Structure 1
C-alpha cells in the first residue's frame, strides 16, 4: 500500500509537463476547429470533451494526446455490420433537404474513407500557417486515412472524427451500462438520453479488413462516469468521502504502460491499451457499487481486486465493452492468442512479486 502511494506521488510529478503540452494542444485544436467549421462539409464540427486528460487520469507521455472532433449529423439510420454489435453502416433516412454530406455517399452509404480523406486534407492545409510553433502530419495506414499530428516538439496528437447522433442508442447497448446499483437507475436513464458517437474504424474481414464501417463510441459517458463516480453525490468532494477509485485506475494504467515499455521490442503488448484497463475498471465498479468498498485506506485491496479481475478477463479471453455487452474487446478477431497469454503471464509475475515493475 505504501508502495502504491509512492507510485501515485511519483505520477503526480508529470502533471506540469502534461498540463503545459495540453495547454498548447488546445491552442492548435482551437485554431483547427476555427478553420474546419468554415468548410461546408463540416460547419457544425465541435470539440468533444472526452479523454484521459479530461478524466483527470492522463498519467504519462506529455508528448501524446487523443482528441475527438464531433460532427452533428442530420437524422441517421444505422444498419449493423454482420452481428458485430459495435460496427455499423451509416445511412441517411433522407429528407430531400440540403445535405452537405451527399458528396461522401456511396449511394445510401456514408463512406468513412471519403469523409476521412476530406478531413485529413483540410487539416493538412490549415496547419502550416503557424499558431503556437510548428506542426506536421504523420501518414499511417489502416483501412482509411486517419490523422496524427506532430506539434513540433514531437508532441503527437491523434485526431478522431466522430459523427454525433441525437437518436436513441442502438439495441446492442440495451443491456450495457449496468450502473443501476452503483450510480442509480435514474442516472442510467439520464445518460442514455444523451447522444452517442460513431468513429470511422475498419472492421476486420478475413485476413484483410473492409467496408466504410463505423464503430459506436461513448467517450463522453466514460468521462462523466469517471468524474462523477461514487454512490454518494459528494464522493471525493470532502475529506470524509475520499475513495480510491481514480487511484486504482491510474495504477492499472501505469502497470500496463510500464509493461509495454519493458517489452517494447516484442510486439506482444502492442494490441493492449488503457481502454482495456478502463473497461475492466468499470466492470469492477459495477461489482463493487458501494463507496465503502473503495476506502482510501483499502487502496491495497482495491487495487488487487482490479488486477485480479483483469487477469480473469485475460484468462478467459473475455472483456465485454461496458456499453455493448456482446462486443468482446478480447475476441480473437481483435487480439491474438499469444498476446493474451503473454500479458496474462506478466501480470501474474508482477502480482506474485509485489509489483516490481513499479519501482
Structure 2
C-alpha cells in the first residue's frame, strides 16, 4: 500500500484522530464561553471591535496530543498604527497611533505616544474575569498571569482549557523588514503570494527580552491565519488532497512532527530541558521543508515513511546549526543562541535521533 515504514506512522495518526471523535461537547462549551466573552467585550468602548479571527472556527488545537486544550485569537481592528522596529529585532515593534479624525477607543491605553501592552492586557483580563463570574452554573476559572502571548487561559469544569490571545489587526502594508519572507513563489504561486500579502497582519503582545532588559510594551508580528491558509491549501495543484490521484501527506507530516515534539516535551517536562521549544518551531521548519520540496509528487502519501524522515532531518539540521528563520521574517532567528541555549538544543537533537533510530518508540510509551 505504501513504502516500508508507513504502517507505524499511520497507526499513530489513527490513534491521534481517534482521540478527536468526542470533541463536539468540549468545542460547544468553548463556543458558548467565547460567545459570552465576545458579547461582553463588544459592549466596552475599548473593545467594540474585537472579533473572532478564524471566522466560523471557535477552536485551533495547537497540541495534537491535547484534545481538551483550545487556542483562540481575538482580533482588534486598531487602524493606521505606525510601527517602529525595536532595536533591529525585525519581529518586536512599538505601536504609535497615526493621525485619525474619529477618536479611537484605544486612547485610554496610551503611555505617552506608545500603546502600552500592559494596560490593554489588564483591561482585557479584568473584563474576562468579571464576565466569567457571570457564569453561574459552570466553574470557568481564569488562570494566573504567566506572560503576554498566552494572554488569558480559562479552565472549564475540570477538563477543558482555552487559550485566548488578543491581537491587533492592521490592514496596512506588511512591515518593511518582513518582505523577503513567505517564499512560496515556486511552491504555491507568485500570484498567491501577492494575494496573501494583501491580507492584514496581526500584532500579539510579547515582551522582547534583551539581555540587558525586556521592554514591557512591545508587540510581535502574527501571520497565523496565513499559516492556516497555507496548511489547508498546501499543494501546487489546486485539487490537492481532493482525490485519490492527488492525495499528499504534508498535513500528516506536520501532525507526526508535532506529536513527536509533544511527547518528548511531556517526558522531560519536569527537568526544564525542553521548556523553550514549541509547536511553532516545527511548523516553521515544516514550511521550510515545503519550500524545499515544492512539488506534490515529492509528498505522495505512499512515501510517508520517507517524507517524515526528511522533515525530521531538516529539524535536526536546524538543531545542529542554531538557525531556523521565521517563515515570514527571514531575519528573525527562532533558533538563535539568545533565545535557546546550546545545551537544550543538543538535548533535543539527541533525543529525536534516538527516537528515529529506534522506530520512534516514544509514540507508544505514553
The TM-score by the shorter chain falls in which range? over 0.9
Shift of 1:336: 2.0
Q: Deviations over 1:133-162 (max 9, x none)?
A: 320111123369932111112322111110
The question of whether the paired residues in 1 share the 8 Å contact of 2:63 and 2:258 is answered with no
Cα deviations across residues 211-250 of structure 1 (Å, max 9, x unaligned)? Answer: 3000000011000000000001010111211100011001
Task: Report the alpha carbon displacement of residue 55 of structure 1 after superposing the two structures with TM.
Answer: 6.7
Q: CA deviation at 1:129?
A: 1.6
Segments of 5+ residues of structure 2 without an aligned counterpart are: 1-5
Instruction: For 1:150 and 1:293, locate their aligned partners in 2 and report how far apart those are by CA, in whole Å.
Output: 42
- Specify whether residues 335 and 212 from structure 1 end up closer, same or farther in structure 2 by C-alpha distance, changes over 3 A only: same
Question: Compared with structure 1, are the counterparts of its residues 74 and 323 closer, same or farther at alpha carbon in structure 2 (3 Å cutoff)?
Answer: same
Residues 214 and 51 (structure 1), Cα distance of their counterparts in 2 relative to 1, 3 Å cut: farther
User: Tell me, what secondary structure is at the counterpart of 2:21?
Assistant: helix
Q: Give the CA deviation at 1:54.
A: 5.9
Counterpart mapping for 1:201-350 below 5 A: 201-206=206-211, 208-350=213-355
Structure 2 distance, partners of 1:148, 1:189, is: 35
Kindly provide the CA deviation profile for residues 160-200 of structure 1, in whole angstroms up to 9, marking residues without a partner as x.
Answer: 11000000001222100000011000000000000000000
1:97-122 Cα distance to aligned partner (Å, 9 max, x none): 31211111111100000000000100
SS at match of 1:230: coil
Change beyond 3 A, Cα 1:103–1:250: same
Structure 2 residue matching 1:148: 3-state secondary structure = strand
TM-fit CA distance, 1:324:
0.3
* Closer, same or farther: CA 252–60 of 1 in aligned 2, 3 Å: same
CA 1:132–1:337: 2 relative to 1, 3 Å: farther
Instruction: Check whether the contact 1:113–1:144 (CA below 8 A) recurs between aligned residues.
Output: no
Preserved contact between residue 248 and residue 306 of structure 1 (Cα < 8 Å): yes
For 1:1-359, list aligned pairs within 5 A.
1-49=6-54, 59-130=64-135, 133-142=138-147, 146-206=151-211, 208-359=213-364
Moved more, 106-115 or 60-69: 60-69
- Cα offset for 1:132? 7.3
Is contact 2:260–2:363 with CA below 8 Å preserved after alignment?
yes
CA contact (8 A) 2:149 2:165 kept: no
Cα 1:294/1:132, change in 2 over 3 Å: farther
**1:176–1:322 Cα contact (<8 Å) kept:** yes
Q: Would you say the 8 A contact 1:85–1:326 is kept in 2?
A: yes
Q: Is the CA contact 2:62–2:71 (under 8 Å) kept in the aligned structure 1? A: no
1:171 is paired with a residue whose SS is coil
121-130 or 19-28: which moved more? Answer: 19-28
* Change beyond 3 A, Cα 1:30–1:257: same
What's the TM-score once normalised by structure 2's chain length?
0.93
Shift of 1:95: 2.2
Aligned residues: 359
Classify 1:258/1:58 alpha carbon distance in 2 versus 1 (closer, same or farther; 3 Å): closer
> Quick check: 1:133–1:151 contact (8 Å CA) kept in 2?
yes
Whether the 8 Å contact between 1:57 and 1:246 is mirrored in structure 2 is no
Q: Kindly tell me: are residues 350 and 132 of structure 1, through their superposed partners in 2, closer, same or farther at Cα, counting changes over 3 Å?
A: farther
Q: Structure 1 residue 131: deviation in Å?
A: 7.5
Judged with a 3 Å threshold, the aligned counterparts in structure 2 of structure 1 residues 131 and 242 are, in CA distance, closer, same or farther, namely farther
Unaligned runs of 5+ in 1: none
